[PDB]
Design a protein around this nucleic acid. Sequence first.
RNA 1: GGGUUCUAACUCAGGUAUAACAAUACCGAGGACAAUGUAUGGUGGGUAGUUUGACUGGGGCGGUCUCCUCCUAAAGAGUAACGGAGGAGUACGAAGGUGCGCUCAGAACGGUCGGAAAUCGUUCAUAGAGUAUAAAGGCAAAAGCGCGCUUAACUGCGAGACCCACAAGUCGAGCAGGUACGAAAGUAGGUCUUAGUGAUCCGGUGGUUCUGUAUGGAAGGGCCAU
RNA 2: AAUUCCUUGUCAGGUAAGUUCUGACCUGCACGAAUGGCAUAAUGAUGGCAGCGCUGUCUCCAGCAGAGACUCAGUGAAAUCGAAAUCGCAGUGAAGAUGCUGUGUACCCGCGGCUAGACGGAAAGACCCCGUGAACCUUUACUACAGCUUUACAUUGAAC
RNA 3: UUUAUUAAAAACACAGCACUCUGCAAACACGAAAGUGGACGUAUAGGGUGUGAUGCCUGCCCGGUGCUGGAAGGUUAAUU
RNA 4: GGCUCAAACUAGGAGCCGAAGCUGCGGAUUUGAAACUUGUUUUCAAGUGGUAGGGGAGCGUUGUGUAAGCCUGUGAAGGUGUGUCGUAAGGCAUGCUGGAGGUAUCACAAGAGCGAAUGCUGACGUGAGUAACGAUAAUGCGAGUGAAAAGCUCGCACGCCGGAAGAUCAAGGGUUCCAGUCCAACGUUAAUCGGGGCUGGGUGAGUCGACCCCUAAGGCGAGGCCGAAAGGCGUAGUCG
RNA 5: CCACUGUCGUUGAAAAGCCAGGGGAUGACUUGUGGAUAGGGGUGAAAGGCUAAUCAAACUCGGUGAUAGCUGGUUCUCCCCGAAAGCUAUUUAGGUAGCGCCUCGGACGAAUACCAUUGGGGGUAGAGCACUGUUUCGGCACCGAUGCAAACUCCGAAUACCGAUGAGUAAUAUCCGGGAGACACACGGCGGGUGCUAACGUCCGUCGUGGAGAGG
RNA 6: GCUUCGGGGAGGCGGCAAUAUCCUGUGAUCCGGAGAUUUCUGAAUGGGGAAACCCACUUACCAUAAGGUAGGUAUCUUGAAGAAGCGAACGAGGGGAAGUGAAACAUCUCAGUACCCUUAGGAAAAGACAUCAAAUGAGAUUCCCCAAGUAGCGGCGAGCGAACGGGGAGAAGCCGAUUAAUGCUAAUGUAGAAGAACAGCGUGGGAAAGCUGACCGUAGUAGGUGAUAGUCCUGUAUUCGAAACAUUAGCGUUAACAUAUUAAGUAGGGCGGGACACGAGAAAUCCUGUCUGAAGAUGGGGGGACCAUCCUCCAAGGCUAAAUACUCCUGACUGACCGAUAGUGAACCAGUACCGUGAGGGAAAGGCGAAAAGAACCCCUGUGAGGGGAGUGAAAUAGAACCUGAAACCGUGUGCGUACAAGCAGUAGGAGCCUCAAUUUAUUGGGGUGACUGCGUACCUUUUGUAUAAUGGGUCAGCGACUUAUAUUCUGUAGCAAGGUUAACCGUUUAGGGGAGCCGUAGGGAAACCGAGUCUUAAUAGGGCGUAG
Lengths: 96, 64
Amino acid sequence: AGFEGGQTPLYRRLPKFGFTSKMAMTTAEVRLSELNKVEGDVISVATLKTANIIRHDMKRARIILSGDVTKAYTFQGVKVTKGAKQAIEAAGGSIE
Amino acid sequence: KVKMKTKSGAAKRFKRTANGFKRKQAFKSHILTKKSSKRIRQLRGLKMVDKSDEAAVRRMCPYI
RNA sequence: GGGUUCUAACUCAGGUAUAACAAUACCGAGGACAAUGUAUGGUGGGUAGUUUGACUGGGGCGGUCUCCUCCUAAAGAGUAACGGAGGAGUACGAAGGUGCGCUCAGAACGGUCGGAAAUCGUUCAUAGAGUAUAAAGGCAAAAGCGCGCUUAACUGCGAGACCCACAAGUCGAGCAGGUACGAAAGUAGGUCUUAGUGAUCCGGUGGUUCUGUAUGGAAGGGCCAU
RNA sequence: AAUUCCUUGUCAGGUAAGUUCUGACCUGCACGAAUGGCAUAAUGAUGGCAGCGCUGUCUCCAGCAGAGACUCAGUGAAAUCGAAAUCGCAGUGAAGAUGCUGUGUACCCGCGGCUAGACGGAAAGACCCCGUGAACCUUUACUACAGCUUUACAUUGAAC
RNA sequence: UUUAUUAAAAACACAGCACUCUGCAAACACGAAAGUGGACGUAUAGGGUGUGAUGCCUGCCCGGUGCUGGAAGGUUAAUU
RNA sequence: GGCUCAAACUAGGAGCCGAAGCUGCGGAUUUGAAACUUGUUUUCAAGUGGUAGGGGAGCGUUGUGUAAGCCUGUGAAGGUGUGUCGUAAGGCAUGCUGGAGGUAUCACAAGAGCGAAUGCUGACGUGAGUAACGAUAAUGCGAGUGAAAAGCUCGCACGCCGGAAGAUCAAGGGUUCCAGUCCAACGUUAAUCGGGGCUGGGUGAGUCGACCCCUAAGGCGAGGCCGAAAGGCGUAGUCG
RNA sequence: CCACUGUCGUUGAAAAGCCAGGGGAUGACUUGUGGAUAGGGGUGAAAGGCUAAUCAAACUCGGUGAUAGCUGGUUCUCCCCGAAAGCUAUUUAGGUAGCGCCUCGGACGAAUACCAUUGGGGGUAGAGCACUGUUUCGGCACCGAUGCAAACUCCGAAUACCGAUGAGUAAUAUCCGGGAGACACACGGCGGGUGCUAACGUCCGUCGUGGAGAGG
RNA sequence: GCUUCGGGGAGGCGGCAAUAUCCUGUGAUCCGGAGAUUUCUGAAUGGGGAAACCCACUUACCAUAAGGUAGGUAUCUUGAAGAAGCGAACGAGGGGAAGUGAAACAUCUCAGUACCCUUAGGAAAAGACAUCAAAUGAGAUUCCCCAAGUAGCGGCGAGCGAACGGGGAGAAGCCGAUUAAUGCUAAUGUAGAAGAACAGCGUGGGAAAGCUGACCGUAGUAGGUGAUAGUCCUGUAUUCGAAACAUUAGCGUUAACAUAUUAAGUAGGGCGGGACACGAGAAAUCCUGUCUGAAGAUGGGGGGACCAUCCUCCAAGGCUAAAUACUCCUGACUGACCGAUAGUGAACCAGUACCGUGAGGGAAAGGCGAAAAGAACCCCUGUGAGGGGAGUGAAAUAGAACCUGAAACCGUGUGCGUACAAGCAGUAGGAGCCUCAAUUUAUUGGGGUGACUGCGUACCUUUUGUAUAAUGGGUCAGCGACUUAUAUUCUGUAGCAAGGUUAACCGUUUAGGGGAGCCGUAGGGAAACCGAGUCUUAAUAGGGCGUAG
Ligand SMILES: [Mg+2]
Ligand SMILES: [Mg+2]
């Protein structure tokens, strides 16, 4: 793997770039269509964990507009995008 | 358990995009006075990995 | 800041006693040296581990290896040979931009020094010149030659193409911002073009909030430039 | 010349005739003084050259003796071996043919001989090249290390 | 004396010569060290090197690289 | 071979031969297309040389389940013939041999298929009844015994060694020594013979040697020294 | 004790001998018995000799199933398709990798090929001296006749290549993906370089055949 | 083989392997517990030594001669008691390669592996925070599944590779969680005992198989028995025994050792190394050869350079079960494991023969039959070998080299062909002959042979190209080469489907539970961050990447 016959390989022709962020390892994006796995109306990081939507070691969560929400939820400690927020309050929930 | 090992040096050069891999371009490290500003502009930023090279990239970074 | 002396560490492969070896005691001789541990510079084929290219009308020797121009190349492109010939590894803050202006080599005739040929005048002269440099292609709207002002040898880019295994390479209208020259329409992102070049890693430097291992910093890393 | 390439150098001697030998010359490709120079009695299963004696070494082989070979009886291997109903020639052809073409010759099978061919057997050519093979050796190749050596600290103190 | 098993020699050795080291717990060698050999020897001895009876002898060059001595200056480690 | 108004050459013409090409007839197969529509049927069109290699469909073998089944002493597996069926791998039946096991079908799992690897093991060929029968010191004959005598025993004669090819040991071996008995194998032939087989016997020490006493080289070595460990050295000694 | 010469023997009587000769034979001699030195170590009157028929690093076991871009071998059957011996790069050159070429699956559907008509650019074959050179003769460097040239061109095809339009024929082209193999090619043509217009020579281009194809 | 204590009840004196003398209901052989005897060598131990040998000293007793019996006599450690040596794997510790990979090679890898050395225990080690975390904090050690081939390290090459945390197994904390005896109580083990039910008929050498009809079953897929048996034997289901000794626990008691009192040459530092996934790196933390050297609770350690703040925890005393590792062994049970070239090297007198000085290397070799009934006797032969009869047996080309009995290879017999003809030995034709069958009778069909004609240079490998005089194979038989594990991607198929699926574990175990985790459902960007968008930019422009599992 990565051997071109002696010609310097592609991954060594090219430069390394970037650094790896530890903050991104604990931030979980949550789709609106995954919320049917939640028990109750409150949507917090703990509730997402017990629904298994996010890993149990995730510290932060972000709710993004991917599917649709079928009931009214109360998002407490999560970041909500613009379209996700409008869809949430169109279904009748609130963000705090 | 035995697993496939990533090419850790290839992972530092290639990143996953939706339908391919992105990469930086070569010839930007040093020797940059003589280079035209068009080349300094156009060698900056991300390219996509070539379709002929993405098989090797997949063989090298099997978990990305 | 150096010597000298001393003895008490340390040494004796000296004497005497302890059976012998050794140790011990004393005496004797040395003595802060020697010697040994750690660290360190030198020396070190004594000994180890290895390297010591490829092409090639066998190999060696010689030559060559990357780039540019012509030909081979069979009127699109490409196309090999240890085929035939030549260049490059730079230069320039003007030799770049612009506005304005100009036209060369030669030959003959006349003219002080002055000639084959200096400078001056005349008549022919589409380039028989020049183009920083090799060759090819080009060049009068000159791309050749002057002058004034200048910094577009700009920043962000770039529709679209050429070439191309990849990595690269090439050309590019147009848009935005700032600028130069021009009265202006404009032209300008280096130089007539095609050589003047070297990936990644690593390390340095100028910037930057992006990150910052409890937290605030910082170190280090990332991004942009070099 | 244990050294001289040119080279069988030249000249002399030896032979009928001498690229060797012996003597000398010096034009030493490329001798030379303890990696010793030039000699040297004696010594050497040492190198070269020349004689006498002697000879089957040879002209040129003859005869004879013994041991095999040959025949019989007993015992009974070997390497090799795709399979063989396994001829010449001139051609052909992976380019030197028992096996293909054309042709010539040839009744079937032994035994004693023989070695021209079967590119005969034997040993995965040691020559030569290749492989980012091996080994061992060399060195002012590289990088280390042993050893040897330098200084600091420790063991390690006192006085002037 | 030697290539046991294709080389016996002009090769090795040799008595002799020279250089050089070594003052004795010698130099040198084996060994991790203890302990040894050198040697129960002592510079007329012991080690290393070359040369190789004997006769006549053994020229010149110290630039290179070694070796020996010297230390004025330059450079230079750990350490501080 | 042979050929001369050709069986040569030139220019024309007409016949014919000639291939796995084309056509005819029968059969199979790939793909596509049409319709009873997962072969259910018929057709049609174009195809079907093939190394490396890609794709598709199967055969057999061992074992597990199906299987406390089914087959099998009225004869299993295996062996060896024959017949028959399929494109093939192969299947089916059956005679003989054999004498105790085998396995339908469908799944499932492989130590799953051999001519080559100077492959590995065993067996057996060719060479070939060929070479050779191991010092050229040498044998002849008469008796005996015996199944059988060149080779054994006895006798006479001949030849060979005799600083050995005789004799005594050490080392090494270990019964080979002696007698009887046997002759398959062993003995490079035969063997009645033997260092072969089998059964018995045979080795007698105060003085010969060992042991023993003693030490050499060289070992080991209370204590001792040294060394990561293991160990190395070394005194007295103790072995040798 | 040794081993100078020769014959023999070389599947030997023998994994180093025999025979006939040869050397040393009171010495740096030969020989018995026991002991010492051990593998990068020993020992060596030195040949890299010898260290148990093994020596430029013994033997045995182990690491170990060392590694081997190399050589050999790789076992049942039938059906369909079917290469390459090129380019680029490479401590590469007989290895490997991307691309090209093969196969299978999917997407797509004429975007493909052939031909007719038609729009292009060209500097080759031929040709020619207008330039760069080169050549001859005449007249007087220039004039006139007269030759030649890969790196000369005042000219200049056929083909080929890039487009358009249009029929018919056709198991097309293109894209995405799974699996490759191949990167030693050879000859006969044609156009050349090289060689000697030598080579079953060599190097390119281009076609056909072989490779991987039997039949006549 | 001797004694005894238990079992058992008719044979027996181990096997090849029989024969003889005998023993045995006065209880043998046999099996289980205990005891007695127990040569010499070997740690080998009285000294020595070429192991199985040589030589002693001494105490007591007996003998009178040249001895006999019973002891004692090594070394080391600790104060009389211990030790030594050997032997599987697993543990802990002291040393520690190289081949190989990097397509060379030196850092690096291999690998702290092989190997050498030391030393335990049934386990060992570790273990109770001078540990992590940064969450609402948790709460020792060990092991498993994830986290994750992630974060990192790395000639940033080849490679190496965590942790935090989550889910499990197991849980425990102490200051005596020690060791060894003995004595009770319980349980076990080490021999054993009983243990159901089938007949007839036919075939057959023999019946267990066939046909008919019964029976037992808490016992029906066991091994045998002359072919295949629930009912013939041994067994199986079930129920069960111990004089003696061992083992495991609980209890009690003894005698040996141990019993810190909070930790200075310590923490930290300089230099050189090592270990940490981490190769000096910006390098924390651990270990220490060398040189140094605190504070000591108003203090100190850690939180990955470092400082401040905050959190956390108290090193320099010791201990501690389980969950984890293993198999020289014992018992029970199992196998889509082998079946004599396989499976152990070894089914057999195998670590043998044989080879080697030695370390060491290292085979080959199974089968008569149901029962020896293993062939009396006769004949040929040498009282040989071998055979032919007779006999036995179902069978003797089952006769001891013995089941079956392939091939290579070598004979004999029969038929046809072949001694004038040139070559991969066949093939397509084709006469004649021979032989079986039909057929109302020399014609066809089957089989054997093949005069004569045409064509025709093996196979494999390797090549541009091979009859090649290029490679390989003497032949046969047997064996001999794309696997296994995990990860990953694509394809098919099945189930579920915007969801799918659990892992380790638990489980009275293919089930059921276990949601930790993983994949999919969103991307852009180095990242923060934003998100159907996002990045770049002064730009809201342009452009890049984006917009059924
Ligand atoms: Mg030898
Ligand atoms: Mg038989």
